[PDB]
Design a protein around this ligand. Structure first.
Ligand SMILES: C[C@]12CCCN1CC1=NNC(=O)c3cc(F)cc4[nH]c2c1c34
Length: 350
């Protein structure tokens, strides 16, 4: 039987739940009878990614929409869906493509998680909790609730919840200090770049088995670069609620996980509208999408030499922007060093 601290044990049970993966799949209206969890393929997902990029290129230069309809039917044949008696959405426009690309990101992560769960070795004497914990190849420690780390993290959550995101409020249940096997060596080349910031990354619970195993990754090459507002990079927020929205929490499942990462942003390429790129212009290290609302720079503090923008929301002074809140994008996985993992209770305002 396991000796892990009991918060870490609940975390492991949460990350490796197959039923949550099946529920995520049912929430995308995927047909679980024709295409169950065990018949999820990495290469099938990549082929779906290629269909999305074919729709992107077709729409972009005046192809038949005959063509685009055929590609949408091919997509629904490659990934079987259960829509009952409604008509499935058509892949004819940019929003359809973006929805399916986010969906495929989560599908790929689910495949990674199930591949982890059913792989490696199994040892009947050992607690499954211990087996999965060491499958994560991460050091997970509980952060003391009265530390100053915890002070700053609670203040970061408390101060940067946007008013637009009025469907819920957040309660911090546990704060974990994580260390990914190998990540600090990979991050070393970027640890004295200027402008390193502690930023949020939310994702579904089922995805953290992937995120803790392999880190935060960039979409595969088959993924359409126009399926993401600022192209194929790793996306962070400085508003806790903007990232928390990407946990895809629900009333039926109100606990989520969110990441705090040291991001070496360096020279930020400032953008107010979508720009589907895979590389930065020479001399830039990150993209910053400017919101009309920013955390107050007055109130930034430092934690292990990293800036924390835990100020309250004020106007940026940016006028012709299409973003309500900031976004930070990096295009090299080495530019990220994950520091903390947070268990959040979503209290839905009903
Ligand atoms: C839809 C998108 C774009 C590429 C994959 N994505 C998933 C995501 N996850 N998590 C975040 O915390 C996040 C925070 C942001 F400020 C902007 C973001 N844009 C994304 C995310 C995101």
């Amino acid at each position: 039987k396991s000796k892990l601290p009991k918060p870490v044990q609940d975390l492991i049970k949460m990350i490796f739940d197959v039923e949550s993966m099946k529920k995520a799949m049912v929430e995308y209206e995927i047909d679980l009878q024709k295409m169950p969890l065990g018949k999820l393929s990495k290469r099938q997902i990549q082929a779906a990614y290629s269909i999305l990029s074919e729709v992107q290129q077709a729409v972009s230069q005046g192809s038949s929409d005959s063509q685009i309809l055929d590609l949408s039917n091919r997509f629904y044949t490659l990934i079987p869906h259960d829509f009952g008696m409604k008509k499935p959405p058509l892949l004819n426009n940019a929003d359809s493509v973006q929805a399916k690309a986010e969906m495929l990101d989560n599908l790929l992560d689910i495949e990674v998680a199930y591949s982890l769960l059913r792989g490696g070795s199994d040892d009947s004497s050992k607690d499954p909790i211990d087996v999965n914990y060491e499958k994560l190849k991460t050091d997970i420690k509980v952060v003391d609730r009265d530390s100053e780390e915890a002070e700053i993290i609670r203040k970061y959550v408390k101060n940067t919840h946007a008013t637009t995101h009025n469907a819920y409020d957040l309660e911090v249940i546990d704060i974990f200090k994580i260390e990914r096997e190998g990540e600090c060596q990979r991050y070393k080349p970027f640890k004295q770049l200027h402008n390193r910031r502690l930023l949020w990354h939310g994702s579904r619970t089922t995805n953290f088995a992937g995120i803790l195993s392999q880190g935060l990754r960039i979409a595969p090459p088959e993924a359409p670069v126009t399926g993401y507002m600022f192209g194929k990079g790793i996306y962070f927020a400085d508003m806790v609620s903007k990232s928390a929205n990407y946990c895809h929490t629900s009333q039926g499942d109100p606990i989520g996980l969110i990441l705090l990462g040291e991001v070496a942003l360096g020279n930020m390429y400032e953008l107010k509208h979508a720009s589907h790129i895979s590389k930065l212009p020479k001399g830039k290290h990150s993209v910053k999408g400017l919101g009309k609302t920013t955390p107050d720079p007055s109130a930034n503090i430092s934690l292990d030499g990293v800036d924390v923008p835990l100020g309250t929301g004020i106007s940026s002074g940016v006028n012709d922007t299409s973003l309500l809140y900031n976004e930070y994008i990096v295009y090299d996985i080495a530019q990220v060093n994950l520091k903390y993992l947070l268990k959040l209770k979503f209290n839905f305002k009903t």
